[PDB]
């Protein structure tokens, strides 16, 4: 919370006590309930937009250090899904001159919640033990579709490990979200096209078009009507079966059932065959592009822009061939002749309505011709090109129902929650910061800067090297299950269940799939988690170049353990096993949030384990780095992507070195920590050189001792805040002398990105849209960092850590918090008649919120 | 109440006291408080036999201050909601030289009464789940005549807030409310043609015209005969879709059941879809008129005014195209081909009976080719010309009907009424006040100052810079909750229930849906709203230009508050929340009027808490200040919109600073309250200027401390009243100097709005008129404001304040009478012979629907005998439960 | 009573003659059809055709008195030459019939 | 209350004597069918006797 | 079409002398109604006699809409233990009664 009075500040919680491990259970934070902190704010400068395309956000009042007001100020929301490949430059657009980004992962096999066999697969095997002949002749098959042998010969197998949906829903999630971008241009708002491109005005008109493989550079159309894999190259291939007897053997063992529930899932039963292929196959199998009609800032050269989804980039799973088998109409043997196989299957396969061309070209809506026993020669299809056919047909509402129906089948309530949380977690993405004195910058336009982008977990993004195909050394980001074929075999045949695949009622689906309103709420699920992140790393003062060469040669001992315990480092079989220190994060998240992240469960000896996205990242990554202006890069700072106003705002708790600096010109305006509250200064007055009220040290004076760090200490970080948000720190040692970090010119501190205004609003002022808690404390060297101020420029600072002097700082006129008159002129402390009067009321909802 | 006797006003309870917090249920206002004072109509009466159109006035006897009593005495009722677009001006009817009014609201989604799925709906995942068995892609699902592959995906992902229907229902009320003027002329005020134009006279034997773009000035039609969207200049689009199927990629989300159960009337259904239609796009589709025959206040020059309905012009924001999907008549395979569909729509729609013109144009009664898969090309209709071509058609009668059907499948009673609250708060409007010396005053004709007007809420009416249609949008005036597509579509086939949506009987629709003297009473409904908001202004005294500049000034901490408090901007747990001080405004109305305003839930994390208009109004417009004489404006008063004898001879109880000044009697006559009662006069450097006995505060501070403002105390607010009722007062500063606020011309207050005497009537005579307690206190720049008199003229009030003299006052001749409320339901209703004949099975079968929302003569323990495997259904795996809020628990940790 | 020139007793009153109500998968009889049951039940001593009905889990007979639907319109006398004249109660048949 | 115009809501009571009474009027030649004042009603009206 | 499609039982077929004629009427039995317009004619004379003729006329049971299904497939019992037919005559001389 922002904060009306300096009492607000000194009454605020510690870091370690909201690091603590607290029990109770608590709720999914969802995006429906942040939506409302966008809308319903204070101001009356504000027109109260109803459209969602307008209230993309966020919009205040602001007081000076001077005194003056400042009416409907902006903040941009620093996320965003879209890259785009058209960027415009003297005011016309112009092809991209920037290699697109990449993402990878570690799938991993999952053997908790191992399977428990059903009574008829009991059965079944006493059947085959007791050597019952009759049960598995010729020609008999079940209702279900599928004849007895293959049902005796697939429960014949034993398997230790369970089975998880998780790449599965993964992959439906990601394809929802990027079908979400195709709905009405009203219920997607306009920033979202001009984060990364700011010269650039989309037009409310007309939708956004989803297209696939038309990027114009870099390889990045993949062959065009000959559609290929963007990771590795190669086509894929798919072929489909009546009957395991005809798959091809060293292909039998990964052969897929396909169950007549998810045929039956939708209008278009190819549809949700070809739906259910791009579940169990490789990602991406192209990659998408979302195109908009954009203008000029003026309005004067409009035209149609390309952006590539960030969740096309993602690469998961990765199996290249497939063989399905279908259900039959009729109980009869299996098909010799051709036309006995055709008209034998439930429902015969085919392309889309898109075209291809390829040396297996496919017309569109062609039917696939059934492979059987006797065949002469047998039959097979690209795979990039079966999916490019469907690529165009896709939609929201019907993978809605097909979700209903795999949660009627199966449960999918919480593993489609989770999925969602790293489809967030993964896909969400913000422009580096770069340096300022004032409210605004940004990077020179069509710039490797202006491109560079982080995770909301203050994690660079990989940038691609080479044209499309690729074909990397790996490179994981983070570990997630797979989806074992042979576990989905014993459930789909009734064989087999496990503990987690308890089937539910469709109206259970979580409510964010099928509904226009997903993508704003991506964006808005994405910060809170920059907000226990961005707490994490602050904390310490560790600088960007120390944690980028902290898992290369640069290394320290604690900086090795250090980034030792944030990642996953551990392997055991068959399990993702959590950092140390990510149970931190997710007790800052439930502390200041009053909310919990969604969990998985996983067995280790014995022992129950619930991980988080914050607890299944991977080490080796390069860290937030804020730009100079001209583009030169600096990285003093511990790392940074998003603005203090949003950590203050949107959290309920906030630990005491964060909190916003109270309006200027009012008594208790903000004021410092000095000895009393145990803590030193350390003047250098034969240089100039004069440094707040700090930690008394303990033999970490100037290089820290073997194996230490820079300890926890909030208002040694809150005089450090005071020392910076005065007009010209530096950031020398103990002896007064240069760190090895680059530095931005002086005064600069990191400052949110701009964007184009709309009527009646106005850039942000001062220090109001700025990074302030990224105060640096450890060097790469290992050496303390002092932020000093001259003798002279230091007195008045001095005088306020004291308590006998008061500073004078910027803020938002937000909530409680009200201008300061010049003058003061107090009168006796008194209660309002009103706020007497409708006081109870006030308690009655601060019950009610504190209740939830 | 009028007071008799000084002991009465001297008794009367302090302001703290009607603001208490009240905890006792009340009845609804429906407005029947204020008729049966104002008019013949005590009981009830037949509307052509009562004649209310000579009904709209305050009547009575006055005494004035020299003795002499003026009987046939006159008052305005002050609101209004139709809009001249032609001015009588020199006995000649000519165009509007001034700019039409706006409005704008905020729609958007909010935490309702928490909601759960029905046991229909389980019955139909356990169909799903024992077809999962079969090589058989079949249509077990099916409901009402939709696809069973529809009933499926309507099935699915309920949304946690709840559902509304309050914008629904404000569009519904609002297009009652425009056309209720198409009712004969002997059953609508006089007044209310004449209150912005007061040298019109309507003509008693012709009935008012409704119509559509007609407008003269200002590109008002909008297009005419091709329409457009008078805000988003805009053209709509709309379609009808036997199946989900055949609607667009880009718009599958969006679409929307019609439920067969409208349309269940013998009467024209092919209306009823247009009124549904009307009620889900956005609103206005268009600028509706009214044009009535009017003459000269000679009688001798008639002609045809257009008029413009207040409802009419605001803006509720919603969607420019639809697709909806209609019933099927027969159960039967999808129709592949067309005879098989239009032959089995439950209902083919077709265009209303007028023509329209411009791309793709419209013949009158054209009929809407299907849409069906395989069909040659898509087609679609404009909606700005489909609705174009109904306006006509609807009337009071048939919403009536309408929302009687709407009322068996969802409960319409309570939410209704609210809307209707919301209705009244944004539509009922009046002009802007002139000083003077004496009873009446109006503005120069067809100025600007003359069509200035105000909300029941002191707060002004925005007026368009522009000929429409706008280019650009008005800021907010006040936040409504919106209708989700998709927990309607699961309400409306009984998939989902919640505690506010219990199905209820067509006879629960409140009055003035019905009635022709809807129009009459909406205009009686907002006299209240005013007392309530003018006390709270008026308890405090700061001025208008100082309201007017509180929101951002950094002069005193204190007044940022006190306006920040007052407006909507609040919210927790993902839900509105109610303005702080509007509950002071709420509990003044329930403690005056001892009537409860029409209110609606939000849930705060499952916690319900009520929300009236009082508490959801939004920053950004000017305050109300009257005019000058000669146009100049002023700001030295506090807020005020209606004269005081309104606010002080309908209230039940009243504050002590309001009350009217008693009637000569013998020796007394009127007096003021003394340093006995606390108070002190003040002095200052010069001797030639007096003040009232005041605050023991008012000694200390010229300018009020930064945390602090004026403070409530009635007693000195009487004796500033005492001081300003002299025909001398002077505004002026601690030390004698003068405000920045600008002034009356000297001797002058605010006076209720003229309009021409009938036969017989009287105009009010000096301040019998006026408004009095608008009393300044505090300055736009930190001063206080004192009133001041010369030494001369200042000796009698003060021994006026020392009980040893009189102050002489006029007064109307008025005894006090306040009914108990005249009915409980909300509704009228009466027992026939038959409603006897024919009552318990009546009253049990109505019970028996009540409890029977989701409910089917199957049960789970018949329909699991025919399931293959019973313990795989995830009705067993699955009891139902209520959905929590903010959201239900998902992945807990074991 | 079921178009424009309506009341409000014409309104309820056409509103009760007739079947307007309309639960899922029901025929909820008119509140007044069971009056003409009556009639019929107590002037010939003899009873019409039910067929059951439930709703809410409550029986509930329903005859052909009380299945029709609203929007028709009423028998009316004519003038010798064809005028028609609506004054009276709708009629059809002569008094000797219903004595 | 319902001597010329009805009450909103309410019409005509059952009345069994007075309905005679109407017969025995209306039996003879040549009723007159007015409203209270003795004025026309808006219904057609039977050539007088029919 | 395969959910809409009507089991025949045997009993409807040996329900008359002629089993096609059983089974037309079925079929009349849960198609839409009218078919057709069905026509009685009756010679009548003048009132002295003068003018014999043939004269038509509609029956008001034949103008009742109701139902009004379209399209319909029916299911038929067959003589013998058999699999499903594959050749014509395999068909035709499978069934307990040929329409």
């Known amino acids: 919370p922002i904060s009306a009075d300096f009492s607000e500040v000194e009454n605020a919680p510690s870091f370690l006590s909201l690091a603590e491990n607290t029990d109770e259970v608590l709720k999914p934070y969802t995006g429906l309930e942040i939506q409302t902190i966008i809308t319903n704010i204070v101001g009356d400068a504000n027109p109260n937009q109803s459209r969602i395309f307008d209230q993309d956000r966020l919009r205040g009042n602001q007081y000076s250090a001077g005194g003056l007001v400042t009416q409907n100020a902006v903040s941009a929301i620093p996320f965003t899904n879209l890259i785009p490949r058209t960027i415009r430059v003297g005011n016309i657009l112009v092809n991209s001159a920037n290699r697109l980004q990449i993402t990878e992962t570690n799938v991993s096999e999952y053997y908790s919640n191992p399977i428990i066999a059903t009574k008829l697969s009991e059965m079944i095997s006493d059947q085959v033990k007791n050597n019952q002949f009759s049960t598995w002749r010729r020609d008999n098959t079940s209702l279900q579709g599928f004849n007895a042998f293959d049902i005796a010969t697939i429960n014949t197998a034993i398997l230790p490990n369970g089975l998880s949906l998780e790449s599965m829903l993964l992959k439906l999630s990601l394809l929802h979200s990027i079908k979400a971008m195709n709905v009405d241009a009203a219920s997607i708002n306009r920033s979202q096209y001009q984060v990364i491109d700011h010269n650039t005005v989309p037009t409310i008109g007309a939708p956004a078009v989803v297209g696939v493989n038309n990027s114009p550079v870099f390889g990045e159309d993949c062959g065009g009507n000959n559609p290929v894999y963007p990771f590795g190259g190669g086509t894929g291939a798919i072929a489909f079966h009546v009957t395991l007897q005809t798959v091809p053997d060293e292909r039998k063992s990964y052969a897929i059932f396909v169950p007549p529930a998810i045929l039956q899932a ?43 989804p960030t969740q096309s980039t993602i690469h998961i799973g990765g199996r290249r061939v497939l063989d399905l088998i279908i259900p039959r109409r009729e109980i009869a043997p299996n098909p010799t002749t051709l036309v006995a196989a055709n008209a034998m299957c439930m429902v015969r396969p085919q392309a889309g309505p898109d075209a291809t061309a390829g040396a297996i070209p496919l017309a569109a809506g062609q039917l696939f011709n059934m492979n059987f026993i006797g065949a002469p020669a047998f039959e097979e299809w690209p795979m990039t090109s079966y999916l490019y056919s469907w690529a165009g047909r896709f939609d929201i509402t019907t993978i809605r129902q097909y979700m209903g129906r795999l949660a009627t089948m199966v449960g999918v309530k919480d593993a489609y929650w989770a999925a969602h949380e790293l489809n967030v977690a993964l896909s969400q993405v913000a422009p580096k910061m770069t340096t300022a004195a004032g409210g605004w910058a940004a990077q020179a336009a069509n710039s490797a800067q202006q491109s560079d982008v982080c995770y909301s977990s203050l994690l660079t993004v990989t940038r691609s090297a080479a044209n499309f195909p690729l074909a990397n050394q790996p490179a994981a980001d983070m570990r997630v299950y797979d ?45 809170p988690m920059c907000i226990a992140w961005t707490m994490y790393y602050h904390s310490r003062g560790i600088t960007t170049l120390a944690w980028d060469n902290a898992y290369t040669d640069n290394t320290n001992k604690w900086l090795q353990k250090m980034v030792r315990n944030t990642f996953s480092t551990t392997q055991s079989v068959g399990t993702i096993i959590p950092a140390r220190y990510g149970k931190i994060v997710c007790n800052l998240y439930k502390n200041m949030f009053h909310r919990a992240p969604a969990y998985v469960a996983t067995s280790v000896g014995g022992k129950e384990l619930h991980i988080t996205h914050f607890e299944r990242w991977l080490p080796g990554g390069t860290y937030a780095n804020v730009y100079s202006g001209a583009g030169a890069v600096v990285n003093c700072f511990s790392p940074v992507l998003i603005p203090d106003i949003w950590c203050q705002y949107f959290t309920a708790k906030l630990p005491l070195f964060a909190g916003a600096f109270p309006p200027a010109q009012g008594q208790n305006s903000t004021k410092g920590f000095n000895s009393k509250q145990g803590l030193m200064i350390h003047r250098n007055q034969n240089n100039n050189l004069v440094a707040p009220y700090l930690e008394k040290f303990a033999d970490n004076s100037s290089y820290f001792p073997v194996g230490q760090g820079p300890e926890i200490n909030d208002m040694a970080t809150w005089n450090g805040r005071l020392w910076m948000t005065t007009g010209n720190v530096q950031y020398l040692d103990y002896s007064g002398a240069a760190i090895v970090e680059a530095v931005p010119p002086a005064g600069e501190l990191p400052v949110g990105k701009q964007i184009p205004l709309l009527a009646g609003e106005n850039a942000p002022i001062e220090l109001t849209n700025a990074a302030t808690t990224c105060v640096p404390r450890y060097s790469n060297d290992g050496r303390r960092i002092f932020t000093y101020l001259t003798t002279a420029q230091s007195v008045i600072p001095v005088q306020a850590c004291n308590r006998a002097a008061n500073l004078a700082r910027s803020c938002w006129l937000l909530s409680n918090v009200y201008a300061e008159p010049a003058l003061q002129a107090l009168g006796d402390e008194v209660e309002d008649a009103f706020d007497t009067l409708t006081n109870s009321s006030f308690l009655d909802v601060a019950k009610s919120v504190a209740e939830s």
């Open 483 to 527: 989806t074992d074929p042979a576990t989905w075999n014993k459930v789909a045949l009734g064989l087999a269940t496990a503990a987690n695949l308890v089937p539910e009622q469709s109206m259970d689906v979580p409510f964010v799939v099928g509904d226009a309103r997903a993508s704003f709420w991506e964006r808005l699920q994405a910060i």
């Open 266 to 308: 939708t209008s278009d039963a190819n549809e949700a065959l070809a739906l259910f292929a791009l579940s169990m196959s490789e990602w991406p199998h192209a990659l998408y592009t979302v195109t908009k009609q954009t203008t000029d800032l003026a309005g004067a050269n409009a035209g149609q822009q390309v952006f590539i």
